[PDB]
Design an enzyme around this catalytic site. Structure first.
Site, PDB file in Angstrom:
ATOM      1  N   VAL A   1       0.842  -1.192   0.000  1.00  0.00           N
ATOM      2  CA  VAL A   1       0.000   0.000   0.000  1.00  0.00           C
ATOM      3  C   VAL A   1       0.882   1.247   0.000  1.00  0.00           C
ATOM      4  O   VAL A   1       2.111   1.147  -0.092  1.00  0.00           O
ATOM      5  CB  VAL A   1      -0.971  -0.031   1.200  1.00  0.00           C
ATOM      6  CG1 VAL A   1      -0.305   0.478   2.477  1.00  0.00           C
ATOM      7  CG2 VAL A   1      -2.257   0.724   0.894  1.00  0.00           C
TER       8      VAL A   1
ATOM      9  N   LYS B   1      -0.624   2.327   6.665  1.00  0.00           N
ATOM     10  CA  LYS B   1      -0.087   0.975   6.790  1.00  0.00           C
ATOM     11  C   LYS B   1      -0.496   0.340   8.114  1.00  0.00           C
ATOM     12  O   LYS B   1      -0.977  -0.799   8.146  1.00  0.00           O
ATOM     13  CB  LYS B   1       1.436   0.993   6.654  1.00  0.00           C
ATOM     14  CG  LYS B   1       1.955   1.228   5.243  1.00  0.00           C
ATOM     15  CD  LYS B   1       3.452   0.956   5.177  1.00  0.00           C
ATOM     16  CE  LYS B   1       4.047   1.322   3.825  1.00  0.00           C
ATOM     17  NZ  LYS B   1       3.764   0.316   2.762  1.00  0.00           N
TER      18      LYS B   1
ATOM     19  N   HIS C   1       9.889  -7.359   1.052  1.00  0.00           N
ATOM     20  CA  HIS C   1      10.172  -6.135   0.310  1.00  0.00           C
ATOM     21  C   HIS C   1      10.593  -6.488  -1.112  1.00  0.00           C
ATOM     22  O   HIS C   1      11.696  -7.002  -1.328  1.00  0.00           O
ATOM     23  CB  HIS C   1      11.257  -5.331   1.027  1.00  0.00           C
ATOM     24  CG  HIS C   1      11.578  -4.021   0.382  1.00  0.00           C
ATOM     25  ND1 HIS C   1      12.774  -3.368   0.588  1.00  0.00           N
ATOM     26  CD2 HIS C   1      10.858  -3.233  -0.451  1.00  0.00           C
ATOM     27  CE1 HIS C   1      12.781  -2.239  -0.096  1.00  0.00           C
ATOM     28  NE2 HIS C   1      11.630  -2.133  -0.736  1.00  0.00           N
TER      29      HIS C   1
ATOM     30  N   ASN D   1      10.984  -2.646  -7.694  1.00  0.00           N
ATOM     31  CA  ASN D   1      10.533  -2.353  -9.048  1.00  0.00           C
ATOM     32  C   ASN D   1      11.723  -2.304 -10.006  1.00  0.00           C
ATOM     33  O   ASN D   1      12.755  -1.710  -9.684  1.00  0.00           O
ATOM     34  CB  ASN D   1       9.779  -1.025  -9.090  1.00  0.00           C
ATOM     35  CG  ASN D   1       8.274  -1.209  -9.075  1.00  0.00           C
ATOM     36  OD1 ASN D   1       7.756  -2.208  -9.573  1.00  0.00           O
ATOM     37  ND2 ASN D   1       7.564  -0.242  -8.505  1.00  0.00           N
TER      38      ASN D   1
ATOM     39  N   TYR E   1      21.107  -7.950  -7.243  1.00  0.00           N
ATOM     40  CA  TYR E   1      19.735  -8.297  -7.588  1.00  0.00           C
ATOM     41  C   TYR E   1      18.709  -7.280  -7.104  1.00  0.00           C
ATOM     42  O   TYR E   1      17.527  -7.416  -7.436  1.00  0.00           O
ATOM     43  CB  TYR E   1      19.374  -9.677  -7.025  1.00  0.00           C
ATOM     44  CG  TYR E   1      20.005 -10.836  -7.765  1.00  0.00           C
ATOM     45  CD1 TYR E   1      20.766 -10.627  -8.909  1.00  0.00           C
ATOM     46  CD2 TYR E   1      19.830 -12.141  -7.325  1.00  0.00           C
ATOM     47  CE1 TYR E   1      21.341 -11.684  -9.588  1.00  0.00           C
ATOM     48  CE2 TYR E   1      20.399 -13.205  -7.999  1.00  0.00           C
ATOM     49  CZ  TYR E   1      21.155 -12.971  -9.128  1.00  0.00           C
ATOM     50  OH  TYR E   1      21.724 -14.028  -9.800  1.00  0.00           O
TER      51      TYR E   1
HETATM   52  N1  LIG Z   1      -6.562   4.811   3.012  1.00  0.00           N
HETATM   53  C1  LIG Z   1      -6.197   3.764   2.237  1.00  0.00           C
HETATM   54  N2  LIG Z   1      -6.501   2.497   2.616  1.00  0.00           N
HETATM   55  C2  LIG Z   1      -6.156   1.437   1.874  1.00  0.00           C
HETATM   56  N3  LIG Z   1      -5.494   1.532   0.713  1.00  0.00           N
HETATM   57  C3  LIG Z   1      -5.128   2.723   0.211  1.00  0.00           C
HETATM   58  C4  LIG Z   1      -5.462   3.957   0.960  1.00  0.00           C
HETATM   59  N4  LIG Z   1      -4.975   4.965   0.224  1.00  0.00           N
HETATM   60  C5  LIG Z   1      -4.384   4.448  -0.889  1.00  0.00           C
HETATM   61  N5  LIG Z   1      -4.480   3.117  -0.879  1.00  0.00           N
HETATM   62  C6  LIG Z   1      -3.962   2.181  -1.924  1.00  0.00           C
HETATM   63  O1  LIG Z   1      -2.536   2.191  -2.019  1.00  0.00           O
HETATM   64  C7  LIG Z   1      -2.121   1.934  -3.365  1.00  0.00           C
HETATM   65  C8  LIG Z   1      -1.172   3.003  -3.876  1.00  0.00           C
HETATM   66  O2  LIG Z   1      -1.849   4.232  -3.668  1.00  0.00           O
HETATM   67  P1  LIG Z   1      -1.617   5.486  -4.639  1.00  0.00           P
HETATM   68  O3  LIG Z   1      -2.206   5.109  -5.979  1.00  0.00           O
HETATM   69  O4  LIG Z   1      -2.167   6.687  -3.905  1.00  0.00           O
HETATM   70  O5  LIG Z   1      -0.002   5.480  -4.719  1.00  0.00           O
HETATM   71  P2  LIG Z   1       0.940   6.763  -4.462  1.00  0.00           P
HETATM   72  O6  LIG Z   1       1.946   6.413  -3.385  1.00  0.00           O
HETATM   73  O7  LIG Z   1       0.082   7.989  -4.286  1.00  0.00           O
HETATM   74  O8  LIG Z   1       1.743   6.838  -5.856  1.00  0.00           O
HETATM   75  P3  LIG Z   1       2.007   8.243  -6.593  1.00  0.00           P
HETATM   76  O9  LIG Z   1       2.383   9.155  -5.450  1.00  0.00           O
HETATM   77  O10 LIG Z   1       3.124   7.946  -7.564  1.00  0.00           O
HETATM   78  O11 LIG Z   1       0.691   8.563  -7.264  1.00  0.00           O
HETATM   79  C9  LIG Z   1      -3.376   1.969  -4.212  1.00  0.00           C
HETATM   80  O12 LIG Z   1      -3.646   0.606  -4.539  1.00  0.00           O
HETATM   81  C10 LIG Z   1      -4.478   2.497  -3.317  1.00  0.00           C
HETATM   82  O13 LIG Z   1      -5.710   1.812  -3.547  1.00  0.00           O
END
Ligand SMILES: Nc1ncnc2c1ncn2[C@@H]1O[C@H](COP(=O)(O)OP(=O)(O)OP(=O)(O)O)[C@@H](O)[C@H]1O
Length: 719
Positions: free
Chosen positions: A400, A407, A450, A453, A660
């Site tokens: 997430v 988290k 962990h 990518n 790796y």
């Molecule tokens: N409050 C929450 N509870 C559960 N899951 C979440 C929550 N907020 C975001 N997520 C999930 O976490 C994952 C990554 O979230 P997001 O798309 O916001 O990535 P990000 O870190 O914002 O990436 P970027 O900053 O590059 O856009 C997604 O699958 C989203 O559904």
């Protein structure tokens, strides 16, 4: 029987035909220094038997000969060049005596026949294989070259074109390709292998097959015209130069010797192979590439020990199903373990199932998986919006957002929707595992899993152990990571763990170089074109995200205020404030326009230079030595601390984590390999020049003690 050795024996059989069987005491047969000697005594017995009319070579193992013994390679690389040349000259005289026997010879090749194993079967006149055959000469992947006539017999057996491709690329062909090319004279099942390999033999003794006419091309110059010669070798020299301007001298060396050894007999062709194998065997790259193989076999060996009495998980799940979620869902389901991928919206679930199907589509492209049976594994991936099936899962990863509040919240909840003995894992890029452990009721079943990518391309799974992470939970995590086709590594808990922890000082030295007036475009040139990184600091920072790096630099500063806090304002801050976040929104250190197919290309921006001049000093020209030293010293200084602090177990595990995990240049072997290739005491004298820049360039006391006697980190081992 005629001769019995520790790894092979020889006996009469049938009607005046001898039989040489490779029966090593272990599980696989290898042409170690003793076996080459034991073969020399066996062939010599065949040279004083007047009743000899046939010779058959076979193996009692699943494979034939796995190759030479790599455990001896690092020792072979150390003997002086003249001694290694003389041994290789007389080790070749062994196979020459096999080839020059006044008798039709054949090797019944079963299973694998790589390295010296294939070089052995090339000496015989005929070769008969099995449908499960894999045969090739992968010696350039370890930095060396065919040393036992491989660069001589295979070009004269298969034609120059096909042999150059196998030898230079270090590839092994299958049972069907070998017959088509010429490596194999016929394919039969292992039952009919031993009998069939004597039927072809008794066609030869009765005069049906002209065996010394088939043997003869391996003794003579190549049948190539000057026009065909120049054509054939530029294709090989060009296909080698394809591979990103190699620091690897083995592929181009293997090609150029076969070119120089054309229009020559077997004596001079072996001589030109010998005179180039020995210098290759002494290159630092050959040591690093062989060290990676042994370290890989030690990392995966330590994996089987931790997972020796723990059953693998049957049902898995991922929480966070974007691109990374699709890769984690694909890699688990593609290798036989179902998955349960759940997000919060359906637009990510489609995007995740989409990406998960693209990876399977590539397997359909070549090395085809049945499209009917391809559906049998995407159907194993279930996109759920609620908590369906979480009762029947055995382990789950959290992939997430990088945000500790989300988290901890989503970990405590999915813990309640899941049985007690079920294990939870976290793909946190930087948050320590022991901190997330306080938000769970059963922390004994939680640890860090962990990925990196690109998940499908980078095979390292950094596995972190919390303060209360038991030993059984990690064995389950290591077991699942191994079943996915991933190379796992276990580390102790700390902010950044090992891979992402040691990479940040590499970025900090980049910001410190730009502050001193360096050019980020040339810095990326030096780290990519000279040190061998796949991506330089600035370019890599744009694909991680300028804000992800900006946030990760804050997490690592509160975890290590001792030496990971900066005083000034750098490029990461200045770029972040201009809303330039890298490839993410197309604006970063470069500008990323969409190309025709959709692969964003980096193009220069004008506002990035004027934006960097505010946070930088006047432009200063740094040498490649200054750039490489100021970029690499803070990193290796960090990987050494992760060894002394107990984060990483051994230098072998740390180098495999860099190779790796971060794409550390394999010809360097890793930080500790690079630290041993370079003078261990030389490193301190190199680092003393830059010791005043920051505490990151200060060599830890452990290395400062070893630099007193130039003590390395890899002990010289026996086989
Ligand atoms: N409050 C929450 N509870 C559960 N899951 C979440 C929550 N907020 C975001 N997520 C999930 O976490 C994952 C990554 O979230 P997001 O798309 O916001 O990535 P990000 O870190 O914002 O990436 P970027 O900053 O590059 O856009 C997604 O699958 C989203 O559904």
């Amino acid at each position: 029987m005629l001769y019995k050795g520790d790894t092979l024996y020889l006996d009469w059989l049938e009607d005046g035909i001898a039989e040489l069987v490779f029966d090593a005491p272990g599980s696989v047969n290898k042409l170690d220094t003793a076996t080459v000697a034991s073969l020399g005594e066996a062939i010599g017995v065949l040279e004083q038997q007047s009743d000899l009319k046939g010779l058959l070579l076979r193996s009692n193992k699943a494979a034939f000969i796995v190759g030479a013994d790599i455990t001896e390679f690092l020792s072979l690389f150390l003997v002086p060049e003249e001694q290694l040349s003389q041994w290789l000259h007389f080790a070749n005289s062994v196979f020459n005596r096999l080839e020059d026997l006044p008798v039709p010879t054949i090797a019944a090749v079963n299973g694998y026949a790589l390295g010296g194993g294939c070089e052995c079967v090339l000496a015989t006149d005929y070769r008969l294989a099995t449908p499960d055959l894999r045969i090739g000469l992968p010696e350039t992947k370890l930095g060396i070259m065919p040393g036992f006539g491989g660069s001589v017999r295979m070009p004269r057996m298969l034609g120059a074109d096909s042999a150059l491709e196998i030898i230079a690329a270090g590839k092994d062909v299958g049972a069907d390709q070998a017959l088509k090319i010429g490596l194999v004279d016929g394919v039969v099942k292992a039952e009919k292998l031993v009998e069939g390999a004597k039927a072809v033999l008794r066609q030869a003794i009765n005069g049906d097959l002209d065996w010394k006419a088939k043997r003869q091309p391996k003794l003579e110059p190549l049948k190539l015209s000057k026009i065909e010669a120049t054509m054939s070798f530029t294709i090989a020299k060009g296909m080698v130069a394809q591979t990103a301007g190699k620091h690897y001298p083995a592929p181009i060396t293997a090609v150029k010797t076969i070119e120089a050894a054309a229009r020559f007999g077997r004596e001079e062709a072996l001589n030109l192979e010998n005179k180039s194998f020995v210098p290759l065997a002494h290159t630092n790259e050959a040591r690093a590439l062989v060290g990676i193989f042994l370290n890989d076999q030690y990392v995966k060996g330590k994996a089987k020990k931790l997972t020796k009495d723990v059953e693998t998980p049957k049902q898995a799940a991922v929480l966070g199903a974007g691109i990374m979620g699709g890769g984690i869902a694909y890699q688990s389901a593609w290798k036989g373990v179902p998955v349960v991928m759940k997000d919060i919206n359906d637009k990510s679930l489609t995007l995740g199932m989409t990406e998960a199907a693209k990876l399977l589509n590539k397997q359909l492209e070549r090395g085809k998986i049945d499209g009917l049976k391809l559906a049998g594994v995407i159907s194993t991936i279930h996109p759920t919006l609620d908590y369906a099936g979480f009762d029947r899962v055995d382990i789950v990863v959290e992939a997430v957002v990088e945000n500790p509040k989300v988290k901890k919240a989503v970990l405590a909840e999915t813990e309640q929707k899941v049985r007690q003995d079920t294990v939870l894992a976290s793909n946190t890029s930087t948050i320590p595992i022991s901190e997330l452990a306080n938000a769970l009721e059963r922390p004994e079943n939680f640890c860090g899993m962990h990925f990196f990518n690109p998940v499908h391309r980078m095979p390292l799974v950094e596995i972190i152990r919390g303060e209360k992470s038991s030993d059984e939970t990690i064995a389950k995590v290591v077991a699942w990571a191994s079943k996915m086709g991933k190379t796992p590594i276990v580390v102790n808990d700390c902010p950044g763990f090992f891979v992402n922890r040691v990479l940040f000082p590499y970025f900090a030295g980049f910001s410190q170089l730009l502050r001193d007036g360096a050019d980020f475009r040339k810095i990326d040139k030096v780290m990519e074109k000279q040190f061998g990184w796949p991506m330089g600091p600035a370019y890599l920072l744009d694909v991680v995200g300028i804000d992800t790096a900006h946030h990760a630099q804050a997490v690592m500063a509160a975890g290590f205020p001792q030496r990971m806090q900066k005083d000034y304002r750098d490029a990461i801050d200045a770029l972040f404030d201009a809303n330039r976040f890298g490839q993410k929104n197309g604006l970063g250190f470069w500008r990323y326009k969409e190309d025709s197919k959709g692969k964003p290309k980096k193009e220069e921006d004008a506002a990035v230079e004027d934006l960097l001049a505010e946070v930088s000093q006047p432009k200063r020209d740094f040498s490649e030595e200054e750039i490489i030293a100021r970029m690499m010293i803070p990193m290796v200084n960090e990987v050494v601390r992760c060894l002394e602090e107990g984060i990483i177990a051994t230098p072998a595990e740390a180098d495999m984590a860099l190779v790796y995990g971060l794409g550390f240049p394999p010809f360097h072997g890793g930080a500790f390999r690079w630290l041993d290739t370079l003078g261990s005491a030389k490193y301190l004298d190199m680092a003393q020049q830059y010791q005043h820049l920051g505490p990151l360039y200060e060599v830890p006391e452990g290395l400062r003690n070893k630099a007193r006697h130039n003590e390395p980190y890899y002990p010289p081992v026996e086989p």
